[PDB]
Amino acid sequence: KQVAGTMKLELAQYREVAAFAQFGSDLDAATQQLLSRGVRLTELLKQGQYSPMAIEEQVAVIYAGVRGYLDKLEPSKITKFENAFLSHVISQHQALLSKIRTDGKISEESDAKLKEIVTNFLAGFEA
Amino acid sequence: DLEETGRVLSIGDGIARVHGLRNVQAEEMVEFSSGLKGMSLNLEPDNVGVVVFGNDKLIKEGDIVKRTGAIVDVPVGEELLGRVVDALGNAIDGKGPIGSKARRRVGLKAPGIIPRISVREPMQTGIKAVDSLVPIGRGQRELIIGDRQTGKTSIAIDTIINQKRFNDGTDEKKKLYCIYVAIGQKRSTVAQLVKRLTDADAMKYTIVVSATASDAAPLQYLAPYSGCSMGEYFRDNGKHALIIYDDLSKQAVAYRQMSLLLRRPPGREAYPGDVFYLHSRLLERAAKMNDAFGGGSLTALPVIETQAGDVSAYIPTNVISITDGQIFLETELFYKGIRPAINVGLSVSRVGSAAQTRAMKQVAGTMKLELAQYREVAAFAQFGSDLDAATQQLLSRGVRLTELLKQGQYSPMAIEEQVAVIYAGVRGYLDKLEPSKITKFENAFLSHVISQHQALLSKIRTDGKISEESDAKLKEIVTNFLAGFEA
Amino acid sequence: SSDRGLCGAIHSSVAKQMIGVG
Amino acid sequence: TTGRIVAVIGAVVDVQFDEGLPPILNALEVQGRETRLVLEVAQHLGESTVRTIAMDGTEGLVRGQKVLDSGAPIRIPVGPETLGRIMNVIGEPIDERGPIKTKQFAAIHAEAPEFVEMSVEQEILVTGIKVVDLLAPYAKGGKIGLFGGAGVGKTVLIMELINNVAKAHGGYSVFAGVGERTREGNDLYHEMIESGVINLKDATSKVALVYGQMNEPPGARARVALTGLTVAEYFRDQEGQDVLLFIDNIFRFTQAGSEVSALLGRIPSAVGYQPTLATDMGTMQERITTTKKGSITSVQAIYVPADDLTDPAPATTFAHLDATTVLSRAIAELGIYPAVDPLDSTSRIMDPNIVGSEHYDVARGVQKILQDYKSLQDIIAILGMDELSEEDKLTVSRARKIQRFLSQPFQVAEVFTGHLGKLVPLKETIKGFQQILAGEYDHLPEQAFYMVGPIEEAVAKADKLA
Amino acid sequence: TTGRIVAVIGAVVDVQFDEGLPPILNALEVQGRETRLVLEVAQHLGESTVRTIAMDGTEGLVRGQKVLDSGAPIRIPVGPETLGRIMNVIGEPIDERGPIKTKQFAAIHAEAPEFVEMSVEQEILVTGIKVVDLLAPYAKGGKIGLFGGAGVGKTVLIMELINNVAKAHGGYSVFAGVGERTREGNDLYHEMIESGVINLKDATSKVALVYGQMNEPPGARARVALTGLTVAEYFRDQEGQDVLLFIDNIFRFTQAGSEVSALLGRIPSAVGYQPTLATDMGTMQERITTTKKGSITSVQAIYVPADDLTDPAPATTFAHLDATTVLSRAIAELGIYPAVDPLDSTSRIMDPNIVGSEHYDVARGVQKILQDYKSLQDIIAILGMDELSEEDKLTVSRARKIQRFLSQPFQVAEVFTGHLGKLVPLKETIKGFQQILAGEYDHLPEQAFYMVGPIEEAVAKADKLAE
Amino acid sequence: DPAPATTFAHLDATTVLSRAIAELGIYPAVDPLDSTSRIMDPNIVGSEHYDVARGVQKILQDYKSLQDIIAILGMDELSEEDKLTVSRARKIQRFLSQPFQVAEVFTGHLGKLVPLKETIKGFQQILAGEYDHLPEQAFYMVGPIEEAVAKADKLA
Ligand SMILES: Nc1ncnc2c1ncn2[C@@H]1O[C@H](COP(=O)(O)OP(=O)(O)NP(=O)(O)O)[C@@H](O)[C@H]1O
Ligand SMILES: Nc1ncnc2c1ncn2[C@@H]1O[C@H](COP(=O)(O)OP(=O)(O)O)[C@@H](O)[C@H]1O
Ligand SMILES: [Mg+2]
Ligand SMILES: [Mg+2]
């Protein structure tokens, strides 16, 4: 809920605005951000078959998107990112995933830990 | 006695199958032992299919049904004026018995081809859009049609309210008795209706016939005919009557219920093969009588509800083709602020000029033309900055006449007030006035001419048109007024 | 070229060839 | 013999006979009524019972009420005495001018002329109306689709066709109002009286009137067309005429058929029409034709439901039409009368194998030039007129002259206008338009060709103007 | 007198009586069942056989099983003792709290109040919902309809109305669950225990509940609206009181009847419906009304089959209402909630002489700009935004903002929006929209107006979106 | 229609032919977005085959979404990115067509049989932009991709 709570209505507004802006005409900072965010979350929601994801791994992936940490990553790279990111947190951060899974929430501590992981990982990834 | 009486074999869904009654006539009113009436619509070899005028709970298998020597007729006359009655002419306003001295059958043949003369006398609605562009004559049948909640009843109410200016007068020729038939509506809607007419002081010359949503199917089916015969009393006695059928869509539904349950064959939309006939025989009873027959008239305004604009659906198709013309209302005009929501491009009166006075006739022709010229170029507007002045003008004149056709509810206008307003537009006095300011202008301008130029309005009426002298007057009233307006 | 579009390959044609006017 | 009513269900009445049964299509007279109530046998149900369709209201009928078999179908008064008279479906006068005193009677159901009785040749029935005869000509014994409605000079066009056919072909007319609106039937009646094609005083009447009004039962409205056609068949068969039959309007004939069919419990076909849609239309239309003895040519006003030309009703009808006259509100607004659309109106016999190579090529040349004139009208509003080539300036001139030469004053409209009416022969029509194309009247002013008969009057009008 | 079952086909049961024949509408009692099975007399078939619809499942029934005439239609408990309680179609408690100890009972069939019993009084009922209050406001004692296809927001909207209006209502409320979800009944029940409008411990309960959900056979869904209605009718007359009546969903009454129509031997009318659709609805709807004796404010959720508003069922319902809220899937698809079509929602009290010319003029102004924007939509969508007049693109930006300012976070919708719910008073709604129309917020971005309460929150959000 | 509609669930692979595709001259007139196979799965056909297929299908679907705009306004109102999808998609549509031995009378070409590996490669290459320089017509009614190239050369 913490990560996805407003996302449905947000994605509905993004799709409407993506259509209305379909003719590339000078857009304000607000809608251009919604567009950037929207196209990126769309990529995160893509998924293969036969590998359903544990909740905590879904949360961490969505977290990256909804907090804006991927807003500058090129949309076509988002999937390569997610798998790279995910395999990193699975091996290296079983402690963080464990806590999110066990507590069923993102504590202020887990939030801080997550931001540190994604931002620095994404930078390494984007080199 | 299985000739004058019978017993109920089966009863359900408002249909009693009755054994016996060997002497009943087709469409005869029989009576059940509980006191409920019925109509003998199906006469079959081994049963009479009777249509029930009330709740079924009161009829059981083996109940005695009697022919009564009854006859399907309604109270008729001027004592119905100011009264609310049901399908059969019974009082429902709770003000005691109707003082009726005469009666008339509900099912009667319309005047033939010979007792008539052309429609000539104006039937004045007081609605600028209608009287100018879709003009109605005495004896005409003009259809009011549109989707739900587009303003259909309003056209009719304002027409009824309008007649006061003539009925309070002393010219008998110009007077108009009103009949409003409510079919299938809810009681509280009808109540608000009569409240409006009462406050408008319109009830004193109006008969309200009401067969509401909980009344049995056959009463809703009869109601228009009942109301019709009450209007024929006027028509046949050198007098003029207006009747509104609100609505015929619901009446058809009610009759369909009956035909289906009598197991008559279903056709398109499950309607039976006699539904065109049902409506055609109702609407032909509106007529303009010749002088040999008193010169009276019955004018009918049937209402039809369309679904999602489908004028080609079955019942709309029937009533459209039966009538002498249609006033089409549209939802999108309505919310654009075009109210009354009349589509002027599509609406038509086939009587036409024959039902206009010379004053209106004059200014209305120019408006019709300039609106038609407007309609062709109408799309060049919002997507036009680099237009030639010729088409810039047609657009400007067009948007402005469109504003003059807008009208408030419950305030119908006298024909001379209408021509004065249209004059301002068709003569180009409002061409430089901003579109948004036109409605304010008209109200104010009209308040002025009514207050200070009663004689000018008196003249346009007396002269029958706008003379050179009246023209001069108006020119100076409008110009100076407009100058003052934009000060 | 100009500000106004909807005129075929006017604007695109010069851009393929390519401070600007329009 | 005499039968008894056993069932009444609206406009369907079942009659049981003790001896011989009336065959299908027989007329039956109900006894014990104020006015005549005819029932037409539709089916034999078995058990000595017939199912009928009522020609008027069935209100008041009792099971047991006596019914007399007439022995034949509906038989109506036919002959010169019906002219100027108005009758209904069952032959009764409804003009209040008393009985229709004819020596002959005729059954309204009859079979189409046999294959041997058919004319193998196609002939024009010259109307003397320039647009019609030149561009979309009428065929002797054919059917014409009249598209129009109100305000386009439709009643005037009809009244003039009645007049012109009497004057040029010695043929009488019949008008059949299928679903006639009572108001409009009265108005039509008096417009004919006022125009002369009906005469109450003498016996010059050129039309007989047959009304099947809107408020009549389905059966009545379904049969009037036959009644009208039967009147007309007299004038073809007995008096050898090229007759005119108006049907106003054909769609309402179809719809009455649809209603009757629905009332008889027959399962509806596509779009809810009667399963017999095509045969209902076939058994009536095939009666309209050229026989060895004469011809009936029918003008049929067409309503196109939902503006769908693929709708079963117009689709079926089109199978029978040999030409269309399209009356245009746009054309009337330009002051062109008759308001015939010269490009929208078509004819099957516009064929050099039928009308000749000279009639053909002039019509095509007229069509071509009016087609070309329109192409330049976008360039007219943009470049103006003085930017055209010397060829294109000349086409605009000629086309504008052709448009006006297609207008014609009508004799039937003399009272309204004062202008003398014209009936232009086919050869003068062809000649006239032939010469405008050639450029023999380029020097003439454009308004000289307007509201004119033959091309000689275009010259006499041009000389008269200062 | 005793009758015998002769035929069972689904919900329809034929019963033969040798002695006295029970009149149509009578309630019959099937002998030898664990739970009370009522059959309601529908038709007299002839030959001392009646046709009935069952009020519960007919499984287990045997030809020849005994049936007793009760002597009357279905009679249910009415009165104060129904408050806090849950009944079914036949007035049995379904809350496992024992007998409903009323003094009197009432037949669920009754005549509609006569024309002379009608009231014409109409004053505005404010909801706190922007789009409703502004464009198509409810009246006290009026008939309100919430139209919508599947999953567009009828129930959420009706729960928000119960939240905003019923919670603080002085008189009594009736909620009738008609052919809807049992889950939603359990939801609503426990939310009302929580909020105190139902009290299980004292006598302060202000709401009576009547339930016949989509787990019930059609006979039960066909009558359960009548049952709720009858409860309300009592509180209206025999107490003269201000009653709120909520029905979710009144279509299910009509659908139920269509389910049994063919087994009752009817030729189908158009779109598969009973020929009696409109009269059936008539004798039912005409009871749901304010009279001179008392006031019912009725709110009725109205399902729209296949999203089609021309469907006979919703189409025939429109004429029965004084205010209509029409919900649209196209709008909901946009994330605009409540998904009210502002160009298809109407009210009888939308009248300058009733709401004042200020309320009226802004409402008509809002609709005009939305209609104008709609009439440009499909056009500029392919022909370019830059090809527009400088006052056209000003209406396009203003309409897009008004579209958004019509949306609102509902208290009831917190689990769907992630936003705290907002209630906006009338004057604030008028003012806000009035301001956007006058150009006052052309500097503010679109999204600032999306999913907020009052106009100050559109301003606050605009600051938060900057950084 | 109930008859075909009901048959779908009985099939492990559907080839849906389209009259609109046929009328464009594309034979076999296969609707490449309405024909499916239960073995179109990376674990069965391999990821390369699977990827090229999904790629072809995506470019064809993207083309399809642009066609309302194209029909009214035309090619010229498209971004450069869109023009590229359109041109590649249209070359892919043509390379899906094939001359059948059985239909030689109608095609006027010799019937062809393309081995799977070469089918994958031809489309793999069109997607990679490798023949954005070649004309459309070159891809029509040929076998392997080499034939498309040689046909382009022959168009001088
Ligand atoms: N000229 C007008 N100006 C402003 N409002 C109007 C006008 N005419 C009608 N209305 C209003 O528009 C609404 C619909 O009017 P009404 O006469 O009820 O139409 P209708 O089609 O008869 N409705 P219904 O029968 O309920 O589907 C009402 O609220 C009227 O008060
Ligand atoms: N006012 C609202 N705000 C946010 N989301 C809503 C709102 N109304 C409906 N929804 C979404 O749509 C779903 C369907 O609404 P509901 O009222 O159950 O539909 P119905 O019209 O079928 O009763 C809700 O469960 C919710 O997810
Ligand atoms: Mg109304
Ligand atoms: Mg719901």
PDB file of C-alpha atoms in Angstrom, chain D residues 326-459:
ATOM      1  CA  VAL D 326     -35.008  13.691 -57.413  1.00  0.00           C
ATOM      2  CA  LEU D 327     -36.536  16.988 -56.206  1.00  0.00           C
ATOM      3  CA  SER D 328     -33.883  19.153 -54.547  1.00  0.00           C
ATOM      4  CA  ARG D 329     -34.383  21.852 -51.895  1.00  0.00           C
ATOM      5  CA  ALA D 330     -31.000  23.264 -52.947  1.00  0.00           C
ATOM      6  CA  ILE D 331     -32.260  23.520 -56.549  1.00  0.00           C
ATOM      7  CA  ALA D 332     -35.520  25.270 -55.534  1.00  0.00           C
ATOM      8  CA  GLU D 333     -33.599  27.866 -53.512  1.00  0.00           C
ATOM      9  CA  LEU D 334     -31.785  28.855 -56.717  1.00  0.00           C
ATOM     10  CA  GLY D 335     -35.227  29.640 -58.183  1.00  0.00           C
ATOM     11  CA  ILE D 336     -35.033  26.683 -60.610  1.00  0.00           C
ATOM     12  CA  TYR D 337     -38.484  25.168 -61.176  1.00  0.00           C
ATOM     13  CA  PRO D 338     -39.144  22.314 -61.554  1.00  0.00           C
ATOM     14  CA  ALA D 339     -36.659  21.675 -58.737  1.00  0.00           C
ATOM     15  CA  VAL D 340     -35.235  18.552 -60.411  1.00  0.00           C
ATOM     16  CA  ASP D 341     -31.643  17.659 -59.556  1.00  0.00           C
ATOM     17  CA  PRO D 342     -30.211  17.173 -63.066  1.00  0.00           C
ATOM     18  CA  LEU D 343     -27.246  15.086 -61.888  1.00  0.00           C
ATOM     19  CA  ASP D 344     -28.963  12.994 -59.181  1.00  0.00           C
ATOM     20  CA  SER D 345     -31.970  12.016 -61.329  1.00  0.00           C
ATOM     21  CA  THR D 346     -31.289   8.902 -63.427  1.00  0.00           C
ATOM     22  CA  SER D 347     -32.953   6.740 -66.089  1.00  0.00           C
ATOM     23  CA  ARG D 348     -32.462   3.129 -67.243  1.00  0.00           C
ATOM     24  CA  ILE D 349     -33.501   4.077 -70.782  1.00  0.00           C
ATOM     25  CA  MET D 350     -30.879   6.824 -71.115  1.00  0.00           C
ATOM     26  CA  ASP D 351     -29.221   4.510 -73.625  1.00  0.00           C
ATOM     27  CA  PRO D 352     -28.550   5.231 -77.306  1.00  0.00           C
ATOM     28  CA  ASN D 353     -30.000   1.776 -78.129  1.00  0.00           C
ATOM     29  CA  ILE D 354     -33.289   3.125 -76.726  1.00  0.00           C
ATOM     30  CA  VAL D 355     -33.511   6.927 -77.035  1.00  0.00           C
ATOM     31  CA  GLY D 356     -31.064   7.400 -79.912  1.00  0.00           C
ATOM     32  CA  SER D 357     -27.442   8.532 -80.195  1.00  0.00           C
ATOM     33  CA  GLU D 358     -28.397  12.206 -80.516  1.00  0.00           C
ATOM     34  CA  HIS D 359     -30.631  12.276 -77.424  1.00  0.00           C
ATOM     35  CA  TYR D 360     -27.879  10.397 -75.566  1.00  0.00           C
ATOM     36  CA  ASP D 361     -24.831  12.504 -76.468  1.00  0.00           C
ATOM     37  CA  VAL D 362     -26.654  15.801 -75.756  1.00  0.00           C
ATOM     38  CA  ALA D 363     -27.760  14.540 -72.325  1.00  0.00           C
ATOM     39  CA  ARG D 364     -24.211  13.321 -71.618  1.00  0.00           C
ATOM     40  CA  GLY D 365     -22.821  16.669 -72.834  1.00  0.00           C
ATOM     41  CA  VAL D 366     -25.266  18.462 -70.523  1.00  0.00           C
ATOM     42  CA  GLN D 367     -24.325  16.166 -67.616  1.00  0.00           C
ATOM     43  CA  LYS D 368     -20.605  16.550 -68.387  1.00  0.00           C
ATOM     44  CA  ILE D 369     -20.777  20.364 -68.466  1.00  0.00           C
ATOM     45  CA  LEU D 370     -22.791  20.586 -65.208  1.00  0.00           C
ATOM     46  CA  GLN D 371     -20.270  18.199 -63.663  1.00  0.00           C
ATOM     47  CA  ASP D 372     -17.395  20.342 -64.968  1.00  0.00           C
ATOM     48  CA  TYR D 373     -19.023  23.591 -63.774  1.00  0.00           C
ATOM     49  CA  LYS D 374     -19.057  22.247 -60.209  1.00  0.00           C
ATOM     50  CA  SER D 375     -15.330  21.349 -60.331  1.00  0.00           C
ATOM     51  CA  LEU D 376     -14.544  24.987 -61.101  1.00  0.00           C
ATOM     52  CA  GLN D 377     -16.803  26.387 -58.330  1.00  0.00           C
ATOM     53  CA  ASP D 378     -14.068  25.942 -55.692  1.00  0.00           C
ATOM     54  CA  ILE D 379     -11.726  27.893 -57.972  1.00  0.00           C
ATOM     55  CA  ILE D 380     -14.518  30.486 -58.462  1.00  0.00           C
ATOM     56  CA  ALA D 381     -14.590  31.451 -54.772  1.00  0.00           C
ATOM     57  CA  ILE D 382     -10.769  31.556 -54.639  1.00  0.00           C
ATOM     58  CA  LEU D 383      -9.317  32.886 -57.924  1.00  0.00           C
ATOM     59  CA  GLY D 384     -12.423  34.790 -59.023  1.00  0.00           C
ATOM     60  CA  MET D 385     -14.004  34.518 -62.456  1.00  0.00           C
ATOM     61  CA  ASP D 386     -11.464  36.543 -64.492  1.00  0.00           C
ATOM     62  CA  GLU D 387      -8.590  34.104 -63.834  1.00  0.00           C
ATOM     63  CA  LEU D 388     -10.054  31.225 -65.882  1.00  0.00           C
ATOM     64  CA  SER D 389      -8.872  30.076 -69.322  1.00  0.00           C
ATOM     65  CA  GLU D 390     -10.810  31.030 -72.479  1.00  0.00           C
ATOM     66  CA  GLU D 391     -12.115  27.454 -72.607  1.00  0.00           C
ATOM     67  CA  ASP D 392     -13.054  27.448 -68.900  1.00  0.00           C
ATOM     68  CA  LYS D 393     -14.745  30.872 -68.992  1.00  0.00           C
ATOM     69  CA  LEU D 394     -16.907  29.473 -71.787  1.00  0.00           C
ATOM     70  CA  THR D 395     -17.920  26.317 -69.873  1.00  0.00           C
ATOM     71  CA  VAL D 396     -19.024  28.404 -66.864  1.00  0.00           C
ATOM     72  CA  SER D 397     -21.091  30.598 -69.213  1.00  0.00           C
ATOM     73  CA  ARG D 398     -22.670  27.638 -71.036  1.00  0.00           C
ATOM     74  CA  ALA D 399     -23.339  25.612 -67.866  1.00  0.00           C
ATOM     75  CA  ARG D 400     -25.037  28.595 -66.178  1.00  0.00           C
ATOM     76  CA  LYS D 401     -27.175  28.979 -69.317  1.00  0.00           C
ATOM     77  CA  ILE D 402     -27.967  25.259 -69.311  1.00  0.00           C
ATOM     78  CA  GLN D 403     -29.048  25.351 -65.636  1.00  0.00           C
ATOM     79  CA  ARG D 404     -31.551  28.103 -66.426  1.00  0.00           C
ATOM     80  CA  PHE D 405     -32.781  26.526 -69.665  1.00  0.00           C
ATOM     81  CA  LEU D 406     -33.675  23.451 -67.564  1.00  0.00           C
ATOM     82  CA  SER D 407     -36.245  25.512 -65.632  1.00  0.00           C
ATOM     83  CA  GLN D 408     -39.742  25.583 -67.143  1.00  0.00           C
ATOM     84  CA  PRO D 409     -42.979  27.479 -66.409  1.00  0.00           C
ATOM     85  CA  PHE D 410     -45.848  25.085 -65.705  1.00  0.00           C
ATOM     86  CA  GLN D 411     -49.400  25.477 -67.014  1.00  0.00           C
ATOM     87  CA  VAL D 412     -50.714  24.177 -63.694  1.00  0.00           C
ATOM     88  CA  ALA D 413     -48.901  27.081 -61.953  1.00  0.00           C
ATOM     89  CA  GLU D 414     -50.356  29.907 -64.130  1.00  0.00           C
ATOM     90  CA  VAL D 415     -52.721  31.119 -61.373  1.00  0.00           C
ATOM     91  CA  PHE D 416     -49.872  31.539 -58.850  1.00  0.00           C
ATOM     92  CA  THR D 417     -47.456  33.251 -61.275  1.00  0.00           C
ATOM     93  CA  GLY D 418     -49.352  34.781 -64.229  1.00  0.00           C
ATOM     94  CA  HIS D 419     -46.637  33.383 -66.539  1.00  0.00           C
ATOM     95  CA  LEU D 420     -47.888  31.246 -69.445  1.00  0.00           C
ATOM     96  CA  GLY D 421     -47.167  27.512 -69.144  1.00  0.00           C
ATOM     97  CA  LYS D 422     -45.056  25.508 -71.579  1.00  0.00           C
ATOM     98  CA  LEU D 423     -45.058  21.940 -72.847  1.00  0.00           C
ATOM     99  CA  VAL D 424     -41.827  21.457 -74.807  1.00  0.00           C
ATOM    100  CA  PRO D 425     -41.732  18.639 -77.404  1.00  0.00           C
ATOM    101  CA  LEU D 426     -38.834  16.164 -77.150  1.00  0.00           C
ATOM    102  CA  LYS D 427     -37.215  17.305 -80.432  1.00  0.00           C
ATOM    103  CA  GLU D 428     -37.257  20.975 -79.390  1.00  0.00           C
ATOM    104  CA  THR D 429     -35.792  20.019 -75.999  1.00  0.00           C
ATOM    105  CA  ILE D 430     -32.925  18.135 -77.662  1.00  0.00           C
ATOM    106  CA  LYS D 431     -32.407  20.885 -80.266  1.00  0.00           C
ATOM    107  CA  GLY D 432     -32.392  23.645 -77.636  1.00  0.00           C
ATOM    108  CA  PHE D 433     -29.725  22.121 -75.382  1.00  0.00           C
ATOM    109  CA  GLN D 434     -27.818  20.889 -78.452  1.00  0.00           C
ATOM    110  CA  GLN D 435     -27.192  24.487 -79.555  1.00  0.00           C
ATOM    111  CA  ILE D 436     -26.135  25.984 -76.191  1.00  0.00           C
ATOM    112  CA  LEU D 437     -23.298  23.419 -76.044  1.00  0.00           C
ATOM    113  CA  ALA D 438     -22.268  24.214 -79.634  1.00  0.00           C
ATOM    114  CA  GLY D 439     -21.881  27.867 -78.619  1.00  0.00           C
ATOM    115  CA  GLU D 440     -24.669  29.260 -80.788  1.00  0.00           C
ATOM    116  CA  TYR D 441     -26.017  31.408 -77.947  1.00  0.00           C
ATOM    117  CA  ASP D 442     -22.831  32.446 -76.100  1.00  0.00           C
ATOM    118  CA  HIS D 443     -23.538  36.050 -77.125  1.00  0.00           C
ATOM    119  CA  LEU D 444     -26.937  35.851 -75.378  1.00  0.00           C
ATOM    120  CA  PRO D 445     -27.381  37.035 -71.767  1.00  0.00           C
ATOM    121  CA  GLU D 446     -27.733  34.304 -69.127  1.00  0.00           C
ATOM    122  CA  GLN D 447     -31.150  35.347 -67.717  1.00  0.00           C
ATOM    123  CA  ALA D 448     -32.792  34.943 -71.161  1.00  0.00           C
ATOM    124  CA  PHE D 449     -32.825  31.139 -70.792  1.00  0.00           C
ATOM    125  CA  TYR D 450     -34.580  31.263 -67.402  1.00  0.00           C
ATOM    126  CA  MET D 451     -38.254  30.276 -66.993  1.00  0.00           C
ATOM    127  CA  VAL D 452     -38.628  29.611 -70.709  1.00  0.00           C
ATOM    128  CA  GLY D 453     -40.115  26.874 -72.907  1.00  0.00           C
ATOM    129  CA  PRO D 454     -38.434  26.204 -76.287  1.00  0.00           C
ATOM    130  CA  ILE D 455     -35.128  27.800 -77.313  1.00  0.00           C
ATOM    131  CA  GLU D 456     -37.058  30.285 -79.547  1.00  0.00           C
ATOM    132  CA  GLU D 457     -38.486  31.880 -76.396  1.00  0.00           C
ATOM    133  CA  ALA D 458     -34.939  32.209 -75.048  1.00  0.00           C
ATOM    134  CA  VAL D 459     -34.220  34.369 -78.130  1.00  0.00           C
TER     135      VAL D 459
END
